[PDB]
Amino acid sequence: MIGGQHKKERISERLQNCQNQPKNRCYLPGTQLLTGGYSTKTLQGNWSEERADAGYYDGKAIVPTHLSKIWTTEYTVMTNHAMKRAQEQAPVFDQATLVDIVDRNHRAYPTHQPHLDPQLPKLKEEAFKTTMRTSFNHPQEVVRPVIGNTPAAQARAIIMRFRRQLLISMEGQSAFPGNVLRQVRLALERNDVVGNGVLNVEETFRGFTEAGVETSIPECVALVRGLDMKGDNMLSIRKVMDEMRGEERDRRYSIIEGVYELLKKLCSNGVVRLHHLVDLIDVDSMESVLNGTVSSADALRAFTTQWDLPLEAHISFETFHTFFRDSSFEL
Amino acid sequence: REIVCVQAGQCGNQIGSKFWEVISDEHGVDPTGTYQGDSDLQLERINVYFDEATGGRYVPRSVLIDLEPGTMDSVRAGPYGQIFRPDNFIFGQSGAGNNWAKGHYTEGAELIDSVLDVCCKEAESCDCLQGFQICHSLGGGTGSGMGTLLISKLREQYPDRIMMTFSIIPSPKVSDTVVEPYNTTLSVHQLVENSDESMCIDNEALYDICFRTLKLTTPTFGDLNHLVSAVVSGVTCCLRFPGQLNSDLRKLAVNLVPFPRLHFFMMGFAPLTSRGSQQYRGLSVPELTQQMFDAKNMMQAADPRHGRYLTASALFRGRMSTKEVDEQMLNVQNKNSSYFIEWIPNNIKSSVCDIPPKGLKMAVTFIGNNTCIQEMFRRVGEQFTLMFRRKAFLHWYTGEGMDEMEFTEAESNMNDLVSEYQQYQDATIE
Amino acid sequence: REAICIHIGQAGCQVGNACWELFCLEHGIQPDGAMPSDKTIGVEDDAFNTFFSETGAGKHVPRAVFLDLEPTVVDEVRTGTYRQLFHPEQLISGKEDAANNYARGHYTIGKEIVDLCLDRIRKLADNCTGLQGFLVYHAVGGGTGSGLGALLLERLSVDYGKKSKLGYTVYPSPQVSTAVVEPYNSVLSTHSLLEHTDVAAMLDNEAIYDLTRRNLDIERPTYTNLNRLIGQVVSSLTASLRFDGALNVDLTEFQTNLVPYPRIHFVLTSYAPVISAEKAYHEQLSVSEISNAVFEPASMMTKCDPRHGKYMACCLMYRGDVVPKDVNAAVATIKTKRTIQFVDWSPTGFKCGINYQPPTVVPGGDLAKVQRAVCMIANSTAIAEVFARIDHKFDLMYSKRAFVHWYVGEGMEEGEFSEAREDLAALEKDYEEVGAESADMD
Amino acid sequence: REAICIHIGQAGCQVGNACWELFCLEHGIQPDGAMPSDKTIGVEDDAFNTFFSETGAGKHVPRAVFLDLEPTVVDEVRTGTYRQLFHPEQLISGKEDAANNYARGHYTIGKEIVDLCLDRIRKLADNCTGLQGFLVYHAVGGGTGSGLGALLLERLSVDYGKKSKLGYTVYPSPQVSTAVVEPYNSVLSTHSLLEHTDVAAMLDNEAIYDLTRRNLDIERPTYTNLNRLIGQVVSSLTASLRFDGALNVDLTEFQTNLVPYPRIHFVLTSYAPVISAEKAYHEQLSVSEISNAVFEPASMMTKCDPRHGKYMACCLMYRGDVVPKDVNAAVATIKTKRTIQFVDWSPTGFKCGINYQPPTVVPGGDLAKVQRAVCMIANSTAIAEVFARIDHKFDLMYSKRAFVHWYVGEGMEEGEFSEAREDLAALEKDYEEVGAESADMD
Ligand SMILES: Nc1nc2c(ncn2[C@@H]2O[C@H](COP(=O)(O)OP(=O)(O)OP(=O)(O)O)[C@@H](O)[C@H]2O)c(=O)[nH]1
Ligand SMILES: Nc1nc2c(ncn2[C@@H]2O[C@H](COP(=O)(O)OP(=O)(O)OP(=O)(O)O)[C@@H](O)[C@H]2O)c(=O)[nH]1
Ligand SMILES: Nc1nc2c(ncn2[C@@H]2O[C@H](COP(=O)(O)OP(=O)(O)O)[C@@H](O)[C@H]2O)c(=O)[nH]1
Ligand SMILES: [Mg+2]
Ligand SMILES: [Mg+2]
């Protein structure tokens, strides 16, 4: 730790007038941890293992000197870029834990260093578990492969997981099919702050959490990196929604295009508007209304609202196509 | 099923302090003696090593014996020393003087009755008593003489229980005392008749463990005693925790001893790795088994590669599959078939316990019955024959009162033990 | 109607946990002993009675005893999840183990525990009105299972007499091994078991490890997997007493059809649709496919190859959606095969059973859900190979009196080794004579 | 699916630093062996396995050993920034250098260090399940690279046998030179490499200096630039094992396609889009331009002119956005050219590979970012001119025994010089005979 302060004499040692070798702590004058006749600063003997100690400290001041800058090795110049990033994080202990480390209290063998083991807390929670208690609990209480390190692979896997979660959940089911993806898109749009239709990692996380999907920050980092095509870590809402709809089969496309071509010929100048669709639809023929579980007026009202357009808006083929890909997601 | 511990002499008291630190840590006992653990699994077998004191406290079932109180003042001053019961410390007023005859005949017979009274008071308190465990050095004076006297008396008073010993034997390279051969010879003669199971440790082997495997720059006796405390606390783990295949000291003896005199065993503990390397290699059953059979990891100077295994036992701690353990033990027996005695169809017993030591995912302790134990005794007998032909220091022993005939009997008995191991090493089916 | 289960030692108690988990989940008893009251049930039912008895308050309690000399495993059962299901008197535990010594269990320590066990079994047998046999689970490799199992079977055989005793023993694996003294304990156990058992189902661990590696996709199996497979086998055999079916089979019919001579009661076992959930949806599982599966040695739960011997009798139990005509077509196709041979004195080699209840699926289990299954128990001379190898290992150790001082010191005469070894030699000749085709007749 | 890297001496370790920097940055492993949380989410991948193995805690450690007789370069690795990436046992260092003496490395000093190296490689090779070759980096101009590289390749070749060994070797350039004894060490090294290597890639520093002056605009290059170019070449050859592609090429297919006779295994290497950012934005870089570029001698990394010989085989690896039809059109256009000639016994002269992963860009690097690249390794008779020049320099010094007393003092017979010189003379005659324009029918 900085400045030592755990290699120094303790008050109990001073009061008891303790000597050196019973505990072999080199702090008294004239005694020092000599490896090969020299200090650990010199590369002789067992310096590598002594430098691997949990309580090791090197006397390097944080404020640097001039000759350190002047005298550099070619290897240091080659590998300095990674060193600057690698020096950001390091484990730290308080003084009581350092006292425990120096006194080497709880160890299976003399060289066992449990404080340097990153899996210690899960070991502690995992301790004192018996085979039967794990294997004989209460019986009531108890994926397409994707290959490659490419970010596109990660994005595809995450998209598939999200789609499966939405199918099993099915929030916001309406009287007319096609409201799940609408709710997800609206939730994403609501958390945009700028107005240009792009999102970053944190807003993506908040939006997908509001939409009902359980995620984490690394998931959103991977997704935004995978779907990025212009190098700015911005996520386009249109692109992600198009990927959430998925690949479309041929029969559904054929029916959609046939219906659109039929509707085109019944209008003037081949321009179709939304009130045409509202007037011409035959809502009382669905299986959900003839069986007797959804009223016809409610179904028509649900259909009219899902377009998110005024009654005089021009409905192109793109809007019709997208609307009925959204609806096919539930059938 | 309770064990009673006896700690004798300087080495025994020092190893015992580290052992009781390890056991108190594993069961979450504070150095004040208060239970502070975090799972009920720790409490249901606390009785095995601890007695219950009234409010929160637990007291350890151990007897401390020594001829000069210097060690007792050192152990009472240690970090866990307060836990020990005051009435369990028995001491005299003058040292053993490194002499077996003084420790066995003059101050031994004077103090032994008070120690037997304490051991009986401790023994009769158990609801069901398991074997005794003894720690002592064979090269010393009070450890060898009074330890073997006490072992003989407890074997007379409790012949149906188990007798287990951990024993320190003189290194082949540097002596700490000039008269080591006499004390060692008399002690091995007493042990081969009295003991049920005996473990032997060379300090040179612990130095080689520290320097080659752990790469410590300046090891101390605390490290050697920590390795010993680790294996001793490990052998009894299946007695005091649940597991898929429970084991017991009597079950170990029944599987390890083919004939009653062949009860001297070698020890090893597997997870050992340097402070720099531990982040670089994960624990797994193949890694533990390969280190477990490497002779570099065995705590005696004789190496198994010059002998053959009659029998061996491995106790594994942790949640792991039994198939991997069984297939590893089959693979090691099949690939190295020349090193296993052929008239026994399966030499290794396995046992599995669910709870590993804190901070380790898995661990195994290994006990081995190998004929290479004959090499240590032969070397001690050589040094004895060089010293005895010239009566090098015999007047001390004769002045205490010993007859020279005891030396010739002890030499003959050790020579017969070496001969019996050598004959089974070179035995054949015919 | 009723059956009493006796569990001995470590393997028997751990296998008991899996068995009672299955019987609870199949009947629907919760871990606290109370069935879900629901709204109502249209008609009264009784199938649980074979394994459970109800109190006046409607709690269920099972007809079983757990016997051990060491406390740890039974205390582990006492502290587990099913604490309220078992009656506390049924879980009997001693102070110390038999330390892999058959002599310690039989002569010194089991003699103290047998009277408590006999008093508990008497109290169970008094609360029955149609008891039709004992099922016993134990391992012969350990000390208490062999010694106390033999002593208790002898006492049960004198007190209850003609009542049947069916054992599901776990004998030592042919190359995987766990303890050095396994041959002595297995030989001495087999000597007592020969005179006092009606049908011995023999199981090995190396076969169930092979079955879990090859068919299921588990690289590192543990005893809970093996015990769940054994529990499935026991549920299949006892289903004939508990549910409606086309052709029921009472436990006396197994002994009548499967055992030709009173000493020839060692049998082999095999279970067909061991399959994982991912493989299960790519394949149909018709009657003929599982019937073809049960005869391959890769399906067996014991380590022996039946192509090196001759079958004497087979009993095939089908449960689930099966129609008798498909069973008949399958058995006729098996009979056509040239690598399956029967001794010429057994022309009608098969017994069939058909039950409508499909196998139950356990929440943490590894088997898939399937509409039909078949289980087989068969008598074959290939079981001689299992003994000859244990006897050879015994001969190797006994030539130097290996470890013998433990057995003679704990109270057993050295003469006991020679009588048992000669009895197993006679069992080898029984398998030689029964397997002989014909003599020189006119 | 796996490869082990062995780095020897100064050039091999310094080129290794650039290689491992690149492989880490291409996979995404941090300098401390970890991998960020977003690379390991959503999908589970194994592509790192060719070069890294993971511990059970998820740390990555690389499959390489570093061998040196002087401590300085390995101590630079031990105290630098990548200290935590490598396992400390893998970094092996001796006490003193081989002092430009092949004899000191091979006979006197390497004999002490070689057994630790073999123990580390054995411990690594036992923890593998699809090892598919050894990659070796060394320079033949120095003492330890020549002597210890030869001794270690001999021992590896006896212990592992048939497994392939591919070497990247820096040979002495034709006029720039750094030490006087380079010809002796290069001849004695080449004698060992003939028997114990499957493909040998030849490099000259003078060619990489010319390429860095001509294509990039660097007037004063240093070893880090050359080492980064070599690392790019190695990444191109090993990309076929690690990423998806249209036409994969396994490391055994290189050896099968490139070597016609067992001694003719020395290949030339070149790389196409070595370009600066200012030129890269002035030009399109279609497949046909880089295919035409790889055959110009200005693109080669070895100082030889291929117009003085005939090609026997070429292997072209394309990585990035390329479609097979343009590769076919390009190869047909190259085949049309009159200054490119193939031996008449090799009519089908080309092997192609196409991989989708584009080349990675290193933060301090000097190469531009490009969508596609091609790398070529080819076998040609022109390489015989390099050996003839080494033999002329050897003959000049050896006629008067200019420095032989050092080699004789360190343990070598004077006869070994004449043996090696006669073996390399036979290699020159092999390249004369194999390249014969035609054989007569009579
Ligand atoms: N299949 C299976 N085998 C088991 C199980 N438990 C133990 N075994 C095997 O049975 C043998 C050990 O027998 P144990 O039941 O432990 O012996 P014991 O009855 O406890 O006898 P003692 O040790 O004297 O108490 C070994 O071969 C084990 O592999 C289990 O749950 N399932
Ligand atoms: N491309 C490149 N060439 C190098 C590098 N280091 C040395 N060389 C060249 O390789 C030759 C020297 O070989 P060395 O590697 O120094 O020899 P060595 O392996 O150290 O052998 P010893 O001197 O005995 O230790 C000269 O032609 C150098 O120009 C390097 O890092 N990169
Ligand atoms: N391993 C170990 N050996 C010890 C320790 N203390 C003393 N010894 C050894 O034991 C021998 C001395 O025996 P000692 O205990 O003094 O005999 P005593 O005088 O009868 O108590 C020497 O070989 C010492 O090296 C210790 O803490 N650990
Ligand atoms: Mg038991
Ligand atoms: Mg050098």
DSSP string for B78-98: STTGGGS-GGGEEE-SS--TT
What are B207's two structure tokens?
A: 């130095």
Residue C403 amino acid letter: F
**C-beta separation of C9 from C141 below 8 A:** no
Closest CA to C294 of C390, C184, C197, C215: C215
**C-beta separation of C141 from C178 below 8 A:** yes
Torsion angle in degrees (nearest 10) through CA of D335, D340, D346, D349: -50
**Alpha-carbon torsion B413, B415, B416, B417, what sign?**
positive
Closest CA to B298 of B223, B247, B231: B231
Query: With helix as H, strand as E and coil as C, how does B103-130 read?
Result: HHHHHHHHHHHHHHHHHHHHHCCCCCEE
Report the pocket of ligand 3 as residue ranges, CB < 6 Å.
Answer: B 9-11, 14-15, 96, 137, 139-143, 168, 176, 203, 221, 224-225
State whether residue A44 is helix, strand or coil: coil
Residue D412 falls in which region: left (phi positive, over 0), alpha (psi -120 to 50) or beta? beta
What are B161's two structure tokens?
A: 């229980």
Question: Cα of B347 to ligand 4 centre, how many Å?
Answer: 20
Q: Where are the alpha helices (DSSP H) in C277-383?
A: 277-280, 287-294, 324-336
Rounded (to 5) percent helix, strand, coil in chain B: 50, 20, 30
Residue in the structure block whose two tokens are 């702050």: A193
Distances (CA, A) of D190 to A159, D395, D421: 56, 16, 10
Task: Tell me whether residue C201 is exposed, middle or buried, using C-beta atoms within 10 angstroms of its C-beta: 0 to 12, 13 to 18, 19 or more.
Answer: buried
Report the pocket of ligand 1 as residue ranges, CB < 6 Å.
Answer: C 9-11, 14-15, 69-70, 97-100, 139, 141-145, 170, 178, 205, 223, 226-227
Any ligand 2 atom below 6 A from CB of D359: no
Q: Do chains C and D touch (3 or more CB pairs under 8 A)?
A: no
CA distance B111 to B108: 5
CA distance D365 to D195: 38
CA distance A288 to A176: 9
Q: Whose CA is nearest to atom 7 of ligand 3?
A: B11
Q: State how far Cα C204 lies from the chain centre.
A: 11
State whether residue C351 is helix, strand or coil: strand
Neighbour count for residue A293 (Cβ, 10 Å):
9
* CB burial string B356-366: b at 16+ within 10 A, e below: bbbbbbbbbbb
**Mutate which of C10, C227, C234 for ligand 1 pocket (most atoms within 8 A of beta carbon):** C10
Which of B38, B216, B359 has its CB closest to that of A110?
B216
Question: Cα of D227 to ligand 2 centre, how many Å?
Answer: 12
Residue D357 amino acid letter: Q
The CA-CA-CA angle for residues D262, D268, D272, to 5°, reads: 145
State whether residue C362 is helix, strand or coil: coil
What are A73's two structure tokens?
A: 């090795």
Closest CA to B79 of B28, B15, B7, B30: B30
Residue C186 falls in which region: left (phi positive, over 0), alpha (psi -120 to 50) or beta? alpha
**Alpha-carbon torsion B47, B52, B58, B59, what sign?**
negative
State whether residue B4 is helix, strand or coil: strand
Chain A residues closer than 8 Å to D42 by CB: 154, 157-158, 161, 219, 222
Residue in the structure block whose two tokens are 């079994």: C121
Residue in the structure block whose two tokens are 């004390």: B183
**C-beta separation of A196 from A235 below 8 A:** no
Task: Tell me whether residue A16 is exposed, middle or buried, using C-beta atoms within 10 angstroms of its C-beta: 0 to 12, 13 to 18, 19 or more.
Answer: exposed
**Mutate which of C70, C170, C175 for ligand 1 pocket (most atoms within 8 A of beta carbon):** C170
**C-beta separation of B104 from B128 below 8 A:** no
Question: Cα of D286 to ligand 5 centre, how many Å?
Answer: 43
By residue count, chain C amounts to: 442
CA distance C418 to C421: 5
**Alpha-carbon torsion B247, B248, B250, B253, what sign?**
positive
β-sheet bridge partners, residue D61: D53
CA distance B218 to B207: 10
The CA-CA-CA angle for residues C84, C85, C89, to 5°, reads: 85
Neighbour count for residue D79 (Cβ, 10 Å):
14
Q: What is the DSSP letter of B298?
A: B
* CB burial string C341-377: b at 16+ within 10 A, e below: ebbeeeeebbbbbbbeeebeebeebbbbebebbbbbb
What are A266's two structure tokens?
A: 């019944």
Residue A91 amino acid letter: P
**Alpha-carbon torsion B219, B223, B228, B234, what sign?**
negative
User: Which are the catalytic amino acids of C?
Assistant: 253
Residue C364 has phi, psi (to 5 degrees) of -95, 5
CA distance C309 to C378: 12
Task: Tell me whether residue C211 is exposed, middle or buried, using C-beta atoms within 10 angstroms of its C-beta: 0 to 12, 13 to 18, 19 or more.
Answer: buried
Residue in the structure block whose two tokens are 């699926």: C361
Q: C64-68 and C2-8: which strand pairing?
A: parallel
**Nearest-CA distance A57 → chain B (Å):** 15
Query: With helix as H, strand as E and coil as C, how does chain D read?
Result: CEEEEEEEHHHHHHHHHHHHHHHHHHHCCCCCCCCCCCCCCCCCCCHHHHCEEECCCCCEEECEEEEECCCHHHHHHHHCCHHHCCCHHHEEECCCCCCCCHHHHHHHHHHHHHHHHHHHHHHHHCCCCCEEEEEEEEECCCHHHHHHHHHHHHHHHHHHCCCCEEEEEECCCCCCCCCCCHHHHHHHHHHHHHHCCCEEEEECHHHHHHHHHHCCCCCCCCHHHHHHHHHHHHHHHHHHHHCCEEECCCHHHHHHHHCCCCCCCEEEEEECCCCCHHHHCCCCCCHHHHHHHHCCHHHECCCCCHHHCCEEEEEEEEEECCCHHHHHHHHHHHHHCCCCCECCCCCCCEEEEEECCCCCCCCCCCCCCCCEEEEEEEEEHHHHHHHHHHHHHHHHHHCCCCCHHHHHHCCCCCHHHHHHHHHHHHHHHHHHHHCCCCCCCC
* CB burial string A298-314: b at 16+ within 10 A, e below: ebbebbbebbeeeeeee
Q: Whose CA is nearest to atom 4 of ligand 1?
A: C11
Q: CB of D399 within 8 Å of any CB in chain A?
A: no
CA distance B65 to B67: 7
- Annotate A154-211 with DSSP letters as a single string: HHHHHHHHHHHHHHHH--S--SSS--HHHHHHHHHHHT-SSSSSEE-HHHHHHHHHHT
Helix axes D415-434, D384-398, angle to 10 degrees: 150
Which of D38, D42, D243 has its CB closest to that of A157?
D42
Question: Cα of C181 to ligand 1 centre, how many Å?
Answer: 13
- Measured between CA atoms, the residue of chain D closest to residue A151 is D39
CA distance D147 to D158: 17
Residue in the structure block whose two tokens are 């309690």: C61
CA distance B356 to B328: 20
Catalytically annotated residue among D154, D206, D253, D428:
D253
CA distance C322 to C316: 13
Chain A positions with Cβ closer than 8 Å to B: 24, 33, 35, 45-46, 48-50, 52-54, 106-114, 116-117, 120, 123, 127-131
In total, the C-beta contacts within 8 angstroms joining chain A to chain D are 77
Non-local (6+) Cβ contacts of C153 within 8 A are: C136, C165, C192, C193, C196, C197
Q: Does the beta-carbon distance from B279 to D55 stay under 8 Å?
A: yes
CA distance C231 to C237: 10
Closest CA to D260 of D386, D385, D430: D430
Q: Does the beta-carbon distance from C222 to A131 stay under 8 Å?
A: yes
Question: Cα of C72 to ligand 4 centre, how many Å?
Answer: 8
Q: Whose CA is nearest to atom 21 of ligand 2?
A: D142
CA distance C21 to C23: 6
Which of D28, D38, D76 has its CB closest to that of A221?
D38
Q: Whose CA is nearest to atom 3 of ligand 3?
A: B11
Chain B residues closer than 8 Å to C101 by CB: 254
Any ligand 2 atom below 6 A from CB of D141: yes
β-sheet bridge partners, residue D247: D354
Residue B125 amino acid letter: S
**Nearest-CA distance B217 → chain A (Å):** 7
State whether residue B138 is helix, strand or coil: coil
Q: State how far Cα C277 lies from the chain centre.
A: 27
CA distance C65 to C108: 22
Task: Tell me whether residue A319 is exposed, middle or buried, using C-beta atoms within 10 angstroms of its C-beta: 0 to 12, 13 to 18, 19 or more.
Answer: middle
Which element (helix H / strand E) includes C4?
strand C2-8
Which of B215, B272, B275 has its CB closest to that of A113?
B275
Closest CA to C303 of C199, C425, C213, C171: C171
Residue in the structure block whose two tokens are 């599987």: B255
Closest CA to C121 of C146, C75, C157: C157
Measured from the Cα of B9, ligand 3's closest atom is 21
Q: What is the DSSP letter of A314?
A: B
What are D387's two structure tokens?
A: 């050996």
CA distance B263 to B258: 9
CA distance B382 to D368: 78
Closest CA to D393 of D186, D209, D191: D186
**C-beta separation of C322 from C373 below 8 A:** no
Q: Whose CA is nearest to atom 23 of ligand 3?
A: B176
Q: D52-54 and D60-62: which strand pairing?
A: antiparallel
Which element (helix H / strand E) includes C318?
strand C311-320
What are D228's two structure tokens?
A: 């980064």
Q: B89-91 and B62-66: which strand pairing?
A: parallel
Q: Which chains border D (3 or more CB–CB pairs < 8 Å)?
A: A, B
The CA-CA-CA angle for residues C349, C355, C360, to 5°, reads: 120
Residue in the structure block whose two tokens are 């497979």: C229
Rounded to a whole number of angstroms, the distance between the first and last alpha carbons of chain A is: 63
Non-local (6+) Cβ contacts of B281 within 8 A are: B273, B287, D55
Non-local (6+) Cβ contacts of D152 within 8 A are: D6, D8, D67, D110, D114, D117, D118
Residues with CB under 5 A from ligand 5 (ion): D 10, 97
Query: With helix as H, strand as E and coil as C, how does C88-118 read?
Result: HHHEEECCCCCCCCHHHHHHHHHHHHHHHHH
Neighbour count for residue D114 (Cβ, 10 Å):
17
State whether residue C13 is helix, strand or coil: helix
**Nearest-CA distance B11 → chain C (Å):** 32
Residue in the structure block whose two tokens are 């007026």: A297
Closest CA to B275 of B217, B350, B333: B217
Between positions 124 and 143 of A, the ones with CB within 8 A of C are: 130-133, 135-140, 142
β-sheet bridge partners, residue C167: C136, C200
CA distance B301 to C239: 62
Any ligand 2 atom below 6 A from CB of D9: yes
By residue count, chain D amounts to: 442
**Nearest-CA distance D89 → chain B (Å):** 8
**C-beta separation of B80 from B23 below 8 A:** no
In total, the C-beta contacts within 8 angstroms joining chain B to chain C are 87
**C-beta separation of D283 from D312 below 8 A:** no
Residue D184 has phi, psi (to 5 degrees) of -65, -45
Q: Does the beta-carbon distance from A75 to D43 stay under 8 Å?
A: no
Which of A133, A137, A139 has its CB closest to that of C25?
A139
Torsion angle in degrees (nearest 10) through CA of D292, D293, D299, D301: -70
Non-local (6+) Cβ contacts of A15 within 8 A are: none
Closest CA to C140 of C424, C377, C433: C424
Non-local (6+) Cβ contacts of B1 within 8 A are: B48, B128, B130, B239, B248, C95, C96
CA distance C104 to B248: 14
CA distance A151 to A182: 27
Between positions 17 and 56 of D, the ones with CB within 8 A of B are: 55-56
